[PDB]
């Protein structure tokens, strides 16, 4: 290799490095240049001819990364070179070839050909390692500009689907999924049918993970309100069992699918976190020793240990008086309109705490 600050002659400088590469690359260096000082011809060469089997030609790749984009197509030639990275399946040095040209530098972003390409690459090319770094700046740039071109949001949905599949961490997969599902019903693939198939997998994730607690997150914003539950998805069949306090519900409502895999253990875990909450928070702070125990239909020192499970959830949390005030504040489970009306209360409640008290504070100082 020789430096980029050697005179350009963009084609010939990028091609003098092909001469240091393979002999196949060299005869298509000479042949590439002697025909014409050339575009696509010269520009596809490193990108398709072998970078033999050792990827220290990151250096001449870097020289290709800035000099293909502007003299010809960026959008087609960025997608070339990236086939190669996924072919060799050594990813750390290809990650430098993706890093150098990530986005917002060396020409123009182009508004998601490059952001699709270079992120489609770095999920596959690298492990989780490289894949992590792009997710903030990607989801930032998604908010700074969403693709008005439909199909590229279907692509950025595909990349979030590659993301949740390349992830084998459940909660990051749940996160990447319920960002993808969030952006799903919001815009693009809605287009009903494309979202209906996804709705099944959402019911898998929401049931299978009881830290996507029952239905709390789905009541917060859009997903249930687009993806039907009284369809044969059976999404609201969770919202059934979520308030109605028994193993009986889910087991009688079966998809024999999800019964097997599945949801078996989490049926009792449902009963726990709903009866503890809808016990506590609709009292609305203090239920007794025996009330909780006969709600949950279980022992005494077991409900002590389950108070600790609820304290490790932080659905309930304070110092707990022993034979009364079993559970108190730190609310986290759904109470849909009870939470709305209490919000509707709150501006009127706050009206003194903001005027009356400040009329004493600001006066005093």
């Amino acid at each position: 290799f020789i430096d980029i600050s050697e005179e350009d002659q963009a084609a010939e400088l990028r091609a003098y490095l092909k001469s240091k590469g393979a002999e196949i690359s060299e005869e298509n260096s000479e042949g590439g240049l002697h025909v014409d000082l050339a575009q696509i011809i010269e520009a596809c060469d490193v990108c398709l001819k072998e970078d033999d089997k050792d990827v220290e030609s990151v250096m001449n790749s870097v020289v290709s990364l800035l000099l293909i984009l502007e003299p010809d197509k960026q959008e087609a030639l960025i997608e070339s070179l990236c086939e190669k990275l996924v072919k060799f399946r050594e990813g750390e040095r290809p990650s430098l070839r993706l890093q150098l040209l990530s986005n917002l530098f060396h020409g123009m972003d182009k508004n998601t050909p490059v952001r699709y390409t270079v992120y489609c690459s770095l999920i596959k090319v690298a492990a989780s390692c490289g894949a992590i770094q792009y997710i903030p700046t990607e989801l930032d740039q998604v908010r700074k500009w969403i693709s008005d071109w439909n199909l590229t949001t279907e692509k950025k949905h595909t990349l979030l689907r590659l993301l949740y599949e390349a992830l084998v961490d459940c909660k990051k997969s749940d996160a990447a999924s319920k960002v993808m599902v969030e952006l799903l019903g919001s815009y693009t693939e809605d287009n009903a049918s494309q979202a209906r198939v996804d709705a099944h997998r959402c019911i898998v994730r929401a049931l299978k993970d009881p830290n996507a607690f029952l239905f709390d997150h789905l009541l917060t914003l859009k997903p249930v309100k687009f993806l039907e539950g009284e369809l044969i998805h059976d999404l609201l069949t969770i919202f059934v069992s979520a308030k109605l306090a028994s193993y009986v519900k889910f087991y009688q409502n079966n998809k024999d699918f999800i019964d097997s895999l599945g949801l078996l253990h989490e049926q009792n875990m449902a009963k726990m976190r709903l009866l503890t909450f809808m016990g506590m928070a609709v009292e609305n702070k203090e239920i007794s020793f025996d009330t909780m125990q006969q709600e949950l239909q279980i022992g005494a020192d077991d409900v002590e240990a389950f108070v600790i499970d609820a304290v490790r959830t932080k659905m309930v949390y304070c110092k707990i008086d022993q034979t009364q005030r079993k559970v108190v504040v730190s609310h986290s489970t759904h109470r849909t309109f009870g939470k709305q009306q209490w919000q509707q209360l709150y501006d009127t409640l706050n009206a003194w705490k903001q005027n009356l008290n400040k009329v004493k504070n600001s006066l005093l100082s």
Binding site: A305, I308, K319, I320, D321, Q322
Partner: protein
């Protein structure tokens, strides 16, 4: 006499000699000042004998000292010296080369113990008189051990377990700290740890060194549990409290709680007519409950109200709600942005004048203000030679 310089032979010889002699000597006839003098001498030698890299024996002496220490001093500084010897076993290993797993096991064991043992010191003498004259000496001990400050706690363990320490550790014990440090949960902890306790407390192949460090570390685990449950519960009957905690006797343990309570590590009304305990939501909020200058456990404080809590909460907790969601804020700030652009826009005009003006200030300020402070200092000559002319 001896032309000192690079003759480590006789040097090292005499050194090790006196060392072993002094060490055992003191740690034999129940002497201690002698041992102290010996250590001081060795330190002095190292100071005046630090010109050479470092030969063997080093590890030997280190281990010896750490051991001899163990008890006298707290297992804190002792455990620190133990970890030091452990680190020495690494260097000596790369140079010593010791192919033995049992060795590593024993090492890790010694490390642990010397670590979990005491979570706080009872400075009665200090709390009485003011006040040392009793801290710089600790600093000196630290220096001796090779440290510059005072060791810390199971912190220490984090320290010497940043290395591959979760691994070599022999699994008699691997799954005992996976309770103490890792696993929750107050109402199961004393239960959970009973078995790895019974495991290690068989002493003869696991270094009997360890199993005298164990009873204090058992009480330290109890001490860890006792601090938590003041935030988990607000009261508890003593009869319930007995069943929560597997232990030898209640009559023993209550006094060890009342001890800890008297030494202000927690606040409890364990003694009480009914024989029931009250932790209390705040009552009077103080650092007596909190353990006043150091936790020994996972951070799980419940909410309490202290001066400037509700003040500074109402400042910032309400602020955040108007920052994170808002349709009213970002427009205002985009027009604050516009007043910020305007000020840099006013500025770049002023900068172009300050490029002329402050240039003329800067260069002249080297001359003029120097010439002014010249006359300030040169006046002392004018004070002197003028007053000489008077008389």
């Amino acid at each position: 006499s001896t032309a000192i310089n690079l003759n480590n032979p006789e040097s090292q010889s005499m050194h090790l000699e006196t060392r072993l002699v002094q060490l055992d000597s003191a740690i034999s006839m129940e002497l201690w000042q002698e041992a102290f003098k010996a250590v001081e001498d060795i330190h002095g030698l190292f100071s005046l004998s630090k010109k050479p890299p470092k030969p063997q024996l080093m590890a030997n002496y280190y281990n010896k000292v750490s051991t001899v220490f163990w008890k006298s001093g707290n297992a804190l500084f002792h455990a620190s010296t133990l970890h030091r010897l452990y680190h020495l076993s690494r260097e000596m290993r790369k140079n010593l080369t010791q192919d033995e797993m049992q060795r590593m096991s024993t090492r890790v064991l010694l490390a642990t113990l010397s670590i979990p043992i005491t979570p706080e010191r009872t400075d009665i003498a200090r709390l009485l008189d003011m006040d040392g004259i009793i801290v710089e000496k600790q600093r000196r001990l630290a220096t001796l051990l090779g440290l510059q400050a005072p060791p810390t706690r199971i912190g220490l363990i984090n320290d010497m377990v940043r290395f591959n320490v979760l691994q070599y550790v022999v699994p008699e014990v691997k799954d005992l700290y996976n309770w103490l440090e890792v696993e929750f949960n107050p109402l199961k902890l004393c239960e959970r740890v009973t078995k790895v306790l019974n495991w290690v407390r068989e002493q003869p192949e696991k270094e009997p060194e360890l199993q005298q460090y164990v009873p204090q570390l058992q009480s330290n685990t109890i001490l860890r549990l006792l601090q938590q449950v003041a935030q988990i519960y607000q009261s508890i009957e003593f009869s319930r409290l007995t069943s929560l905690v597997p232990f030898v006797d209640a009559f023993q343990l209550e006094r060890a709680i009342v001890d800890a309570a008297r030494h202000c590590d927690l606040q409890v009304r364990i003694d009480h007519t009914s024989r029931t305990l009250s932790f209390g939501s705040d009552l009077n909020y103080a650092t007596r409950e909190d353990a006043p200058i150091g936790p020994h456990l996972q951070s799980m404080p419940s909410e309490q109200i202290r001066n400037q809590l509700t003040a500074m909460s109402s400042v910032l907790a309400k602020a955040l709600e108007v920052i994170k969601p808002a349709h009213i804020l970002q427009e205002k700030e985009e027009q604050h942005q516009l007043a910020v652009t305007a000020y840099l826009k006013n500025s770049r005009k002023e900068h172009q004048r300050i490029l002329a003006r402050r240039q003329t200030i800067e260069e002249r300020k080297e001359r003029l203000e120097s010439l002014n402070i010249q006359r300030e200092k040169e006046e002392l000559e004018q004070r002197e030679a003028e007053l000489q002319k008077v008389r």
